[PDB]
Amino acid sequence: TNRSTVKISNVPQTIVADELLRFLELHLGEDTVFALEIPTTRDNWKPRDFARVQFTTLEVKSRAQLLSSQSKLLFKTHNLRLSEAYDDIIPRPVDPRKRLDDIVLTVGFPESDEKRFCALEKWDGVRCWILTEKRRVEFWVWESGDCYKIEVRFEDIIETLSCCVNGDASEIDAFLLKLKYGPKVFKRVTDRYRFCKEDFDFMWIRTTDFSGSKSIGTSTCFCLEVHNGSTMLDIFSGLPYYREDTLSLTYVDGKTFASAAQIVPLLNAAILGLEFPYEILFQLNALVHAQKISLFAASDMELIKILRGMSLETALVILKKLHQQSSICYDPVFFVKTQMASAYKRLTEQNIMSCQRAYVTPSKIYLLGPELETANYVVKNFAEHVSDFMRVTFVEEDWSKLPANALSVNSKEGYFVKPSRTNIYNRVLSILGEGITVGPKRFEFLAFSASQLRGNSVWMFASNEKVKAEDIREWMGCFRKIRSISKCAARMGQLFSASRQTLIVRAQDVEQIPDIEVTTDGADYCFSDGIGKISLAFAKQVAQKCGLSHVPSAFQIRYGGYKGVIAVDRSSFRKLSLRDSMLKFDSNNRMLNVTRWTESMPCFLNREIICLLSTLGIEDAMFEAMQAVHLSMLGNMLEDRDAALNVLQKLSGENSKNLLVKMLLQGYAPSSEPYLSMMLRVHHESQLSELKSRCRILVPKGRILIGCMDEMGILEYGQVYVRVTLTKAELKSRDQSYFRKIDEETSVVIGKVVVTKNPCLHPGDIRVLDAIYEVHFEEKGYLDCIIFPQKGERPHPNECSGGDLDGDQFFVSWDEKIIPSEMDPPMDYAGSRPRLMDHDVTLEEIHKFFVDYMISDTLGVISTAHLVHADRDPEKARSQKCLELANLHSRAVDFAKTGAPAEMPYALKPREFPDFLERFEKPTYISESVFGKLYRAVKSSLATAKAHRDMYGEKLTSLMIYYGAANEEEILTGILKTKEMYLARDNRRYGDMKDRITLSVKDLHKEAMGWFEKSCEDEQQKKKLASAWYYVTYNPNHRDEKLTFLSFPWIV
Amino acid sequence: IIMFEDIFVVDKLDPDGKKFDKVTRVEARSHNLEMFMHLDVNTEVYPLAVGDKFTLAMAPTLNLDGTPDTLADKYEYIMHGKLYKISEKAELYVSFGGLLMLLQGDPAHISHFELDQRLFLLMRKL
């Protein structure tokens, strides 16, 4: 009953669409059939056995269903059987009242504070269809012959208002549609078995704005001119957030605000014609982009005159105060009337920089503003032009990832299928070429990192007289030696990861040592991919500036274009050693920096590991018991203080000091201390939500750490050394058969430990390794580093889906319950042939590669399809389908380095989803595998002082309202219980936002610590004042009418 | 004398043609017993339409109290055939002179049927 389209089961093959249409119109009412379509296996001469018919009204559909149920439809000795259809032939509403023809369409924004509306462009005779089922509204506009489709979703419109144009308050002749996001724009492009009753034989492709003045791009509101429409209020009442009030508007001549440039919603620079600062102008433009202040309301002469002469700090404060409020401000002039060095040290202490972030959409551009975030290596030596750096990402109108159909839609022309680029493709190319011009600046493309390529983000630097983009590019290094487009871009964007500064190393303390390579069975296997050596004095010198007490045995490092992990050796000559197969490109500088040294984090059992371990013989009883005991331990964590400390000391951080951790061992009852109680509750909720989203089993007998190889040659093929730190469980009972107590803090393992990488889709990745204890190896002093053998047939990293020694973590677990009997050879790691050009890169082919990475990017769907297929058929990860999926996944993960598309087949798509998925719209099927059992189990289980305090509360509220947080716990922990439509799809952006908010709150805590230190500066008196602050924040009588937060004194 | 007796409702017809002039295999699902049946019925001589309800009976002999190999008046679609395959939710394969019958139900519902025995097929459409 949802839709009027009905699928006919069996029809004769000899019939045509006209005969069936005549039969239906004879049995049913006259011309009651709208669309009739018979699919054809061939082009135009081999129709199928079924057909789909769309009726004009639901009553006709019900009558046809009743006739079919009574077997009263006999067409050429065939009894037609009617059934529901998956989708309609034409997206057309059933109700004739919703269909609106010949109505005037205009666009604009609330230019004035009063009830005044400005019209940018007016379209006459447009078609408006309201689709309640699709939750969207279609607008058909005919301009210069070819028509365009404008789709507005229900989420796009934030409020519905009714207005009048004739001038009568009683009459309702207009409707205002306040749109938050931009609307999709389509374009029409140019029969025996298709009646269709009309000329609907075309296709829709997404295109950019078709307006000459780009009115749609700069308009955030839509007005629908209509007749009196007394009964139209009921139809318009279905729109979300409808206002049942009568309002009148006044048309204002706003045809002057028309920009022919690609970037529409930016303010004009020639209007100012003065020395206005760039930062204030950027803040104002970002405010205009947000749904706070309209363009015309911020383009007045009075506002710019007032803001031109004023103190910079107060201007920024009032601007951020105006931006922080959720309510729309109509008259910012009245608001601002009623309202009335460090960068370098921040970079040195925590690498804190204010980076401008920009969002490029097909309709308009969104500027986030000077958001604080971590810093890369480039800004270390380019810390003068902080505002010149801008992060630019390409997303859709809803700030989601651009679909593959929006760029280069496929079309069959001639003998073969030739893709045709859409207007969005050309728009992206033009934006990358010309650049973004914001105020007195123009941003040019520098490079994109490896992570930014997946996220469709890029860095842009504004050219200046002292330094330009080409100057920075040539300072980073010479990339003309690379003849591969993907490789050159990867190398150029490689030196953009966050790292901590240290001492500078000269070029005279270098050496070249031979590597090792063995060729067996005609396969080139290289052991030394990114390995290196380091001395003890150099390790101490490097660790001094980052504050490391224990010297790590291995740490990921990169300098001068080199990249790889280096191990500590006790027989080194000098402080530095270099190998051969490490130089990616020749760099002009040799600055040293490190990213991460070592972490003894306990390992977890992800979905892939459990999926590949359900074949060797591991039964579901062990997994169910482990999940049940984990849930039992987590449930008692709330009411038991002993369980909380054990959980915190064995799940996140082996040796971590925190305020909650210190009070967990010694504290009051869980009922008391609401500040810690709410944090414990939200942590439990986050853990259970993460368990529901994905399988993350907490195991105490496993860790994750990087591994290296030593120049000993004593370990044979399959023999390694396992060493890790001692946790609470290990210290409580260290007497075990597979555990050797070599030291108080470090315990050696003698059990059978397997190694696996984070991505794994092949049964051959599992390899059983026996741990061996040797005095000679222990004499070198290795810790938190798996010792890979130097000699052998094939290297161990190659066994784990062709891994390399570039500081990547490894999965190690000294568990004796696994089944080591079954062994499967791993898949080959031979990649595709590199593509070498005959000429140098002209800076355009790299842009083409970057844009073409958006299309044919099936990295995320291959893993889901593999999981679904393994869930469906028995003997998973053994059939040829799983092997093909693993090969496709390897080819897709090699896309970032070599320009080879994955080419995901259509027949390999899952089309079905288990219960443990967030795709509620997609069909959900009951799963009976181990993951289904885990999901069922978890479902069953779940079923002076005052001034500082006020300032801290104001800062916290400002941060919460800027980031959308409504509670203290969700902004302190960094996890948001509510998310937008795009944040819930991909986890990379959500993780980036969580890291940013964590950095912001840590900066606020540091500022509060500095204020506390400056306030008193006397240790005993500081303790007394802290006790007084705790007393004054604990007394309920001292809290005022405002929302007083109790997280201010809790700093240590 | 009647081994299996139940009420069946036809679900669909494989040819689904009024004037196909061919044997039409009917699919019927039992009521209160949940048994699926395949039967080849000549629609032209004995018309059956989707949604109709009919009773079905199976007896080794049509005589009263013995005399294997007078229920003719009660029913109207008598047939004679033999059961040749009992392999399975056990199912039966009875051929009425080349007209195959597939009665799929439960192991307890159909258990008194022997291999290579002659059985009749009584059917009345109420």
Judged on CB neighbours under 10 Å (0-12, 13-18, 19+), A670 is middle
* Cα separation, A811 vs A702, whole angstroms: 8
Query: Does B18 sit within 8 Å of A81, measured CB to CB?
Result: no
* Cα separation, B126 vs B120, whole angstroms: 19
Question: B49 to chain A: which residues are within 8 Å by CB?
Answer: 71
Q: What is the largest CA-CA distance in chain B?
A: 42
Query: Does B17 sit within 8 Å of A78, measured CB to CB?
Result: yes
In this structure, the number of other CB atoms found within 10 A of the CB of residue A859 comes to 17
Q: How is residue A703 written in tokens?
A: 């860790």
Question: A81 to chain B: which residues are within 8 Å by CB?
Answer: 12, 16
Which residues face B53 on adjacent strands? B9
Query: Does A79 sit within 8 Å of B17, measured CB to CB?
Result: yes
Pick the residue of B13, B14, B16 with the most A CBs within 10 A to test the interface with A by mutation: B16
Q: How is residue A613 written in tokens?
A: 């371990």
* Cα separation, A451 vs A457, whole angstroms: 9
Q: What are phi and psi of A678, to 5 degrees?
A: -65, -35
In this structure, the number of other CB atoms found within 10 A of the CB of residue A347 comes to 17
3 state SS of A219: coil
Question: B17 to chain A: which residues are within 8 Å by CB?
Answer: 77-79
Which residues face A644 on adjacent strands? none
Collect contacts of A903-909 with beta carbons under 8 A, ≥24 apart: A903/A856, A904/A858, A904/A861, A904/A862, A904/A865, A908/A865, A908/A869, A908/A881, A908/A884, A909/A861, A909/A865
DSSP alpha helix (H) spans, A529-605: 536-544
Question: Contact A810/A704 with Cβ under 8 angstroms?
Answer: yes
* Unique residue bearing structure tokens 């390529």: A453
* Cα separation, A963 vs A995, whole angstroms: 13
Q: Which residues are CB-contacts of A114 (< 8 A; sequence separation ≥ 6)? A: A250, A330
Q: What are phi and psi of A50, to 5 degrees?
A: -125, 170
Query: Does A71 sit within 8 Å of B50, measured CB to CB?
Result: yes
Q: How is residue A759 written in tokens?
A: 């991505």
Q: What is the largest CA-CA distance in chain A?
A: 102
Which residue in B13, B18, B50 is closest to A74 by CB distance?
A: B18
- Beta strands A389-394; A352-360: pairing state: parallel
Q: Which residues are CB-contacts of A139 (< 8 A; sequence separation ≥ 6)? A: A105, A126, A127, A128, A149, A150, A151, A152, A183
Which residue in B16, B19, B49 is closest to A10 by CB distance?
A: B16
CA distance, residue B19 to nearest chain A CA (Å): 6
> Residue A148 belongs to what H/E stretch?
strand A147-153
Question: Contact A998/A374 with Cβ under 8 angstroms?
Answer: no
Question: Contact A404/A410 with Cβ under 8 angstroms?
Answer: no
Q: Which residues are CB-contacts of A893 (< 8 A; sequence separation ≥ 6)? A: A759, A859
What are the C-alpha distances in Å from A396 to residues A178, A185, A370?
A: 19, 12, 22
Chain-centroid distance of CA A407 in Å reads 20
Q: What angle do CA A466, A472, A477 make, to 5 degrees?
A: 140
Angle between helical axes of A674-693 and A930-942 (0-180°, round to 10): 150
* Unique residue bearing structure tokens 């290094």: A477
Binding-site members of A are 804, 806, 808
Question: B12 to chain A: which residues are within 8 Å by CB?
Answer: 81
* Cα separation, A179 vs A110, whole angstroms: 12
* Unique residue bearing structure tokens 């920075």: A472
3 state SS of A153: strand
Q: What is the dihedral of CA B60, B66, B72, B73, to 10 degrees?
A: -140
Query: Does B20 sit within 8 Å of A79, measured CB to CB?
Result: no
CA distance, residue B51 to nearest chain A CA (Å): 8
* Closest residue of chain A to B15, computed from CA coordinates: A78
* Cα separation, A316 vs A281, whole angstroms: 11
Q: Which of A200, A199, A194, A198 is nearest to A21 (CA)?
A: A194
DSSP alpha helix (H) spans, A703-774: 728-732
Question: Contact A1026/A1049 with Cβ under 8 angstroms?
Answer: yes
* Cα separation, A71 vs A66, whole angstroms: 9
Q: What is the dihedral of CA A892, A894, A900, A901, to 10 degrees?
A: 10
Question: Contact B104/B53 with Cβ under 8 angstroms?
Answer: no
Which residue in B19, B20, B49 is closest to A71 by CB distance?
A: B49
> Is the sign of the CA dihedral A237, A239, A242, A247 positive or negative?
negative
What are the C-alpha distances in Å from A440 to residues A17, A269, A821?
A: 63, 8, 69
* Cα separation, A217 vs A360, whole angstroms: 12
* Cα separation, B56 vs B7, whole angstroms: 6
Q: Which of A234, A246, A252, A232 is nearest to A169 (CA)?
A: A246
Query: What DSSP letter does each residue of A690-721 carry, written as one string?
Result: HHHHS--EEEEEEEEE-EEE-TT----TTEEB
Interface of A with B (CB under 8 A): 10, 69-71, 74, 77-79, 81
> Is the sign of the CA dihedral A440, A446, A449, A454 positive or negative?
positive
Chain-centroid distance of CA A668 in Å reads 40
Q: Which of A974, A935, A975 is nearest to A692 (CA)?
A: A935
A431: left (phi over 0), alpha (psi -120 to 50) or beta: alpha
Q: Which residues are CB-contacts of A368 (< 8 A; sequence separation ≥ 6)? A: A286, A356, A357, A358, A359
First-residue to last-residue Cα distance in chain B = 20
Looking at chain A, after which residues does the C atom sit over 2.5 Å from the next written N, breaking the chain? 190, 340, 943
* Unique residue bearing structure tokens 């506009």: A141
How many residues appear in chain A?
Answer: 1052
* Cα separation, A565 vs A595, whole angstroms: 11
A772: left (phi over 0), alpha (psi -120 to 50) or beta: beta
Which residues face A905 on adjacent strands? none
Check if B19 contacts A (Cβ < 8 Å). yes
3 state SS of A946: helix
Question: A79 to chain B: which residues are within 8 Å by CB?
Answer: 13, 16-18, 50
* Unique residue bearing structure tokens 């000329």: A199
Angle between helical axes of A641-648 and A620-635 (0-180°, round to 10): 120
Question: A74 to chain B: which residues are within 8 Å by CB?
Answer: 18
Which residues face B82 on adjacent strands? B95, B118
What are the C-alpha distances in Å from A332 to residues A318, A634, A743?
A: 10, 51, 68
Query: Does B20 sit within 8 Å of A71, measured CB to CB?
Result: no
3-state secondary structure chain B: CCCEEEEEEEEEECCCCCCCCCCEEEEEEECCCCCEEEEEECCCCCCCCCCCEEEEEECCCCCCCCCCCCCCCCCCCCEEEEEEECCCCCEEEEEECCEEEEEECCCCCCCCCCCCCEEEEEEECC
Q: Which residues of A363-375 are buried (b: 16+ CB within 10 A; e: fewer)?
A: bbbbbebbbebbb
Question: Contact A1016/A1026 with Cβ under 8 angstroms?
Answer: no
CA distance, residue A876 to nearest chain B CA (Å): 28
Q: Which residues are CB-contacts of A743 (< 8 A; sequence separation ≥ 6)? A: none
Collect contacts of A673-679 with beta carbons under 8 A, ≥24 apart: A674/A1046, A675/A1046, A675/A1047, A675/A1050, A678/A969, A679/A969, A679/A972, A679/A973
Which residues face A601 on adjacent strands? A704
Question: B13 to chain A: which residues are within 8 Å by CB?
Answer: 79
3 state SS of A420: strand
DSSP alpha helix (H) spans, A54-192: 58-69
Judged on CB neighbours under 10 Å (0-12, 13-18, 19+), B94 is buried
In this structure, the number of other CB atoms found within 10 A of the CB of residue A171 comes to 16
* Closest residue of chain B to A10, computed from CA coordinates: B16
Query: Does B16 sit within 8 Å of A79, measured CB to CB?
Result: yes
* Cα separation, A582 vs A568, whole angstroms: 18
* Cα separation, B76 vs B72, whole angstroms: 7
Query: Does A77 sit within 8 Å of B17, measured CB to CB?
Result: yes
What are the C-alpha distances in Å from B108 to residues A157, B30, B83, B85?
A: 62, 15, 18, 17
Query: Does B49 sit within 8 Å of A77, measured CB to CB?
Result: no
CA distance, residue B13 to nearest chain A CA (Å): 10
Question: A50 to chain B: which residues are within 8 Å by CB?
Answer: none
> Is the sign of the CA dihedral B35, B39, B44, B45 positive or negative?
negative
Which residue in A69, A70, A78 is closest to B16 by CB distance?
A: A78
Question: Contact A885/A865 with Cβ under 8 angstroms?
Answer: yes
> Is the sign of the CA dihedral A22, A24, A30, A34 positive or negative?
negative
Question: Contact A64/A12 with Cβ under 8 angstroms?
Answer: no
Q: Name the residue type at position A550.
A: H
Check if B66 contacts A (Cβ < 8 Å). no
Question: B52 to chain A: which residues are within 8 Å by CB?
Answer: none
Query: What DSSP letter does each residue of A518-532 carry, written as one string?
Result: EEETTEEEES-SS-E
Q: What is the dihedral of CA A374, A379, A385, A389, to 10 degrees?
A: -60
Q: Among residues 37-56 of chain B, which lie with CB inside 8 Å of chain A?
A: 49-51
Q: Which of A538, A449, A461 is nearest to A498 (CA)?
A: A449
Query: Does A69 sit within 8 Å of B18, measured CB to CB?
Result: no
Q: Which of A921, A919, A915, A920 is nearest to A935 (CA)?
A: A915
Question: Contact A9/A83 with Cβ under 8 angstroms?
Answer: yes
Question: A69 to chain B: which residues are within 8 Å by CB?
Answer: 51
* Cα separation, B90 vs B102, whole angstroms: 11
Q: Among residues 71-110 of chain B, which lie with CB inside 8 Å of chain A?
A: none
> Residue A204 belongs to what H/E stretch?
strand A203-206
* Cα separation, A635 vs A937, whole angstroms: 14
3 state SS of A748: strand
* Cα separation, A152 vs A398, whole angstroms: 11
* Cα separation, A159 vs A175, whole angstroms: 11
Q: What are phi and psi of A703, to 5 degrees?
A: -135, 175
* Closest residue of chain A to B13, computed from CA coordinates: A79
* Cα separation, A298 vs A256, whole angstroms: 15
Q: Which of A1046, A1051, A1052, A1050 is nearest to A1034 (CA)?
A: A1046
Q: How is residue A210 written in tokens?
A: 């078709």
Query: Does A79 sit within 8 Å of B18, measured CB to CB?
Result: yes
Question: Contact A631/A615 with Cβ under 8 angstroms?
Answer: no
Q: What is the dihedral of CA A80, A81, A82, A85, to 10 degrees?
A: -110
* Cα separation, A565 vs A561, whole angstroms: 13
Query: Does B17 sit within 8 Å of A71, measured CB to CB?
Result: no
Catalogue the E-assigned strands of A741-875.
Answer: 746-749, 752-756, 768-771, 786-788, 810-813
* Domain spans, chain B: 4-126
- Beta strands A117-131; A242-246: pairing state: unpaired
* Closest residue of chain B to A72, computed from CA coordinates: B49
* Closest residue of chain A to B52, computed from CA coordinates: A70
Query: Does B50 sit within 8 Å of A79, measured CB to CB?
Result: yes
Query: Does A78 sit within 8 Å of B51, measured CB to CB?
Result: no
How many residues appear in chain B?
Answer: 126
* Cα separation, A188 vs A105, whole angstroms: 19
* Unique residue bearing structure tokens 């053998």: A789
Query: Does A74 sit within 8 Å of B16, measured CB to CB?
Result: no
Q: Which residues are CB-contacts of A832 (< 8 A; sequence separation ≥ 6)? A: A891, A894, A898, A900
Question: Contact A431/A395 with Cβ under 8 angstroms?
Answer: no
What are the C-alpha distances in Å from A110 to residues A107, A329, B97?
A: 10, 11, 85
* Unique residue bearing structure tokens 């990192």: A449
Q: What is the dihedral of CA A452, A457, A463, A467, to 10 degrees?
A: -10
Q: Which residues of A614-642 are buried (b: 16+ CB within 10 A; e: fewer)?
A: bbbebeeeebeebbeebbebbeebeeebe
Binding-site members of A for Mg(2+) are 804, 806, 808
Angle between helical axes of A485-494 and A845-852 (0-180°, round to 10): 90
* Cα separation, A330 vs A293, whole angstroms: 6
Query: Does A70 sit within 8 Å of B51, measured CB to CB?
Result: yes
